[PDB]
Amino acid sequence: AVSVAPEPQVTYRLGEVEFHFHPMYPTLFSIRSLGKDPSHSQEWIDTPMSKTIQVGAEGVEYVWGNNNPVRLWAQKSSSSSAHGNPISIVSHYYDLYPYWTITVL
Amino acid sequence: YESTTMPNQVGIPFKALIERPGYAGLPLSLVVIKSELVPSLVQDYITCNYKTVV
Amino acid sequence: YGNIPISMDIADAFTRIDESPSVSLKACEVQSCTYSSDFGGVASISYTSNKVGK
Amino acid sequence: YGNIPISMDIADAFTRIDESPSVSLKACEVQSCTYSSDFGGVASISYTSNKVGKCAISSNSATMKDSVQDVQESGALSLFFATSSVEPNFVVQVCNARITCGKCEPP
């Protein structure tokens, strides 16, 4: 039987996930990805810090101590509705990846 | 998701719907009865009548 | 004085649509017109609907 | 990842054709347009039906979450959609009948 500290609070914005890390005593955390291109790190969070990762409904996973991992597609209580041009383009109005700035140029 | 701007005019009812577009049957109505400026003060000094006795 | 920004995340889904009647025969009647402006507006709006909803 | 080509004989005939709804006045309303990336989809279509049946619905360039609807009469019909999943475009059909939709993309 083991207990470790609270899993990071999530805050949400337009195409954005922000995480507040919150420990009690030093807790091992991993930052990974498998809805995105491979990455791995390990660090101990002894003191809170915010890490912001963007997710456009791809999939980002965070691993916090001895608790189940959580993967999110940035699910909220909102939805889209027939967005995006018929020929391939990027999520939301925002210019990046340039496909809204290409018409200006 | 969020976020409207009502002006501060008292007793006029403003209506907000917001979370995502579409219609709701229960929406938020909010009215301001009053703004209230309440002190947070430093007492500079006190003065009062005094009884001078000769 | 000023404007008050307000933000809310409120549950209004529920089940969407929460009933939206389509509407026809839209009219504006304006009556009770007497000068002043320190009191509220009095308009009457006439319409006819093809469904009941909220 | 990987694509599955599939083939079927669903035991067609049956006693086809003997039901086939047709539908008129086909429209799209757009609600719940927010610029958050989710998989949901919350829109309505307005039409009128007077043919009582089930047709095989819907679509081969669009995705509804419904697929069986006995339409006898019709009005506004809210449906769920798989938006920003594998459809960013939709050719909306309700039976043999169709329009293309929808809206919401500001600059």
UniProtKB/Swiss-Prot annotation, chain B:
Superkingdom, taxonomy of origin: Viruses
Q: Where in the cell is it found?
A: Virion membrane; Host cell membrane
- Provide the topology term for how it sits in the membrane: Single-pass type I membrane protein
Post-translational modification note: N-glycosylated.
Q: How does it assemble?
A: Interacts with spike glycoprotein E1. The precursor of protein E3/E2 and E1 form a heterodimer shortly after synthesis. Processing of the precursor of protein E3/E2 into E2 and E3 results in a heterodimer of the spike glycoproteins E2 and E1. Spike at virion surface are constituted of a trimer of E2-E1 heterodimers. After target cell attachment and endocytosis, E1 change conformation to form homotrimers. Interacts with 6K protein.
- Function (record text): Class II viral fusion protein. Fusion activity is inactive as long as E1 is bound to E2 in mature virion. After virus attachment to target cell via host MXRA8 and endocytosis, acidification of the endosome induce dissociation of E1/E2 heterodimer and concomitant trimerization of the E1 subunits. This E1 trimer is fusion active, and promotes release of viral nucleocapsid in cytoplasm after endosome and viral membrane fusion. Efficient fusion requires the presence of cholesterol and sphingolipid in the target membrane.
- Protein name as it appears in the record: Spike glycoprotein E1
Native source species: Barmah forest virus
